[PDB]
Structures are given as structure tokens and as C-alpha cells.
């Protein structure tokens, strides 16, 4: 029984999963991006070879921004990320 809650601040980010799949994750202060995929993957147990993340620019219309995998996950909270092969 989803959809039906007041407006509140939730610490979660949108990760891009292949096959049109989408899942949000909550991170603790001092967390890294490498860890941001641990919570989403923990549920499916899928071990990939190479993955890369990109955060979308909120200043322009819709560009691509390369970020570090060891970057603070709580710093990109409420935003969206995108991972690709190699």
C-alpha cells in the first residue's frame, strides 16, 4: 500500500539499474559512492566487472558529470546517479 504520506525530507538517491530498474538508497554521513551501490546490490547479490557513476547537473538543462567513486555519498543525497559498463 504505497503513496500516501506527508511531505518530509528523506535521505535517499536514485541509482540507474539496467533493464529499466530503479531503486533508492539511504546513506550515513561519511559514506562513499562505492558504498552507495552496496545497499542496492545487497538485495540482488549481483557482482559486476566494471561500473561507473555520473551525477546529473542541476545548473544547466541536462548534462553529464563525472564524479569519484570514493566521494561522499551523503554529499549527493536527494540527487540521482548513473552507472555504466567499463
- Domain membership of residue 4 (yes or no) is no
- Domain membership of residue 39 (yes or no) is yes
- Which distant-in-sequence residues (6+ apart) come within 8 Å of 86 by Cβ? 50, 52
**Cα separations (Å) of 49 from 14, 44, 46, 52, 57?**
21, 15, 10, 11, 27
* Residue in this structure with the C-alpha cell 555504466, named with its chain if needed: 84
Q: How many domains does the chain have?
A: 1
* CATH number of the CATH domain containing 36: 3.10.20.90
Expressed as residue numbers, the domain containing 48 is: 13-84
**Spatial separation of the C-alpha atoms in residues 85 and 69, rounded to whole Å:** 14
- Domain membership of residue 42 (yes or no) is yes
**Spatial separation of the C-alpha atoms in residues 68 and 72, rounded to whole Å:** 9
Backbone Cα Rg of the chain: 13
Give the three-state DSSP class for 7.
coil
- Domain membership of residue 3 (yes or no) is no
Cα angle for residues 9, 65, 46 (degrees, 5° grid): 75
Q: What burial letters (b/e) apply to 17-53, b meaning 16+ CB within 10 Å? A: eeeeeeeebebeeebbbeebbebbbeeeeeeeeeeeb
Dihedral sign, Cα of residue 59, residue 50, residue 36, residue 10: positive
Amino acid at each position: 500500500g504505497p503513496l500516501g504520506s506527508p511531505s518530509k525530507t528523506s535521505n535517499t538517491i536514485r541509482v540507474f539499474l539496467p533493464n529499466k530498474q530503479r531503486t533508492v538508497v539511504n546513506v550515513r554521513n561519511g559514506m562513499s559512492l562505492h558504498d552507495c551501490l552496496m545497499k542496492a546490490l545487497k538485495v540482488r547479490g549481483l557482482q559486476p566487472e566494471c561500473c561507473a557513476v555520473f551525477r546529473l547537473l542541476h545548473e544547466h538543462k541536462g548534462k553529464k558529470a563525472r564524479l569519484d567513486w570514493n566521494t561522499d555519498a551523503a554529499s549527493l543525497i536527494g540527487e540521482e546517479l548513473q552507472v555504466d559498463f567499463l
